[PDB]
Design a protein around this ligand. Structure first.
Ligand code: HEM
Length: 152
């Protein structure tokens, strides 16, 4: 649950992402894969990437970063009223991709890391607080759907 002022902060931060969605999406995925290499194994189309240089050179990885962040942005713009948008993603991630909730924690922290890395000094303490709460709400509503499905 976020206040109006917190949502305003989230959507202000998101304007930074929308100015370069592919570059942000690329770096989020690279941070996830390099920090948590077990996550790479869930992607049949990226498991061939052995080095970060290959990850950086991959145009398909940048494309997928755009898909991921476009979906997240659509959810965030709903300010918590995201049941219709979140349900298919919870279902596909539990039943088809088999993504444990832990990996959604990993990517949430990776988003925070990338924002500080690309906007040092321009991602303030209030903005970090509000973005963190928004990603927690996203993860928590996914977790509720995971429990319904019995997925661990
Ligand atoms: C911010 C969180 C995330 C968002 C919004 C997101 C969004 C999406 C979207 C929109 C798709 C394509 C449609 C679909 O299959 O439902 C996708 C595919 C996928 N997601 Fe996620 N995702 C997230 C986190 C993750 C994480 C943490 C993992 C794994 C560590 C992951 C693994 C996958 C895989 C395996 C695919 C299929 C890729 C394919 O072969 O083309 N997702 N995701």
């Amino acid at each position: 649950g976020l206040s109006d002022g917190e949502w305003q902060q989230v959507l202000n931060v998101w304007g930074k992402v929308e100015a370069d969605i592919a570059g942000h999406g690329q770096e989020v995925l690279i941070r996830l894969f390099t920090g948590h290499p077990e996550t790479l194994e869930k992607f049949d189309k990226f498991k061939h990437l052995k080095t970060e240089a290959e990850m950086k050179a991959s145009e398909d990885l940048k494309k997928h970063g755009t898909v991921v962040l476009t979906a997240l942005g659509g959810i965030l713009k709903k300010k918590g009223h995201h049941e219709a948008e979140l349900k298919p993603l919870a279902q596909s991630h539990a039943t088809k991709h088999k993504i444990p909730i832990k990996y959604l924690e990993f990517i949430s922290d990776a988003i925070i890391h990338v924002l500080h890395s690309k906007h040092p000094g321009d991602f303030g303490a209030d903005a970090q607080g509000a973005m963190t709460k928004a990603l927690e709400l996203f993860r928590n509503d996914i977790a509720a759907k995971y429990k319904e499905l019995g997925f661990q």
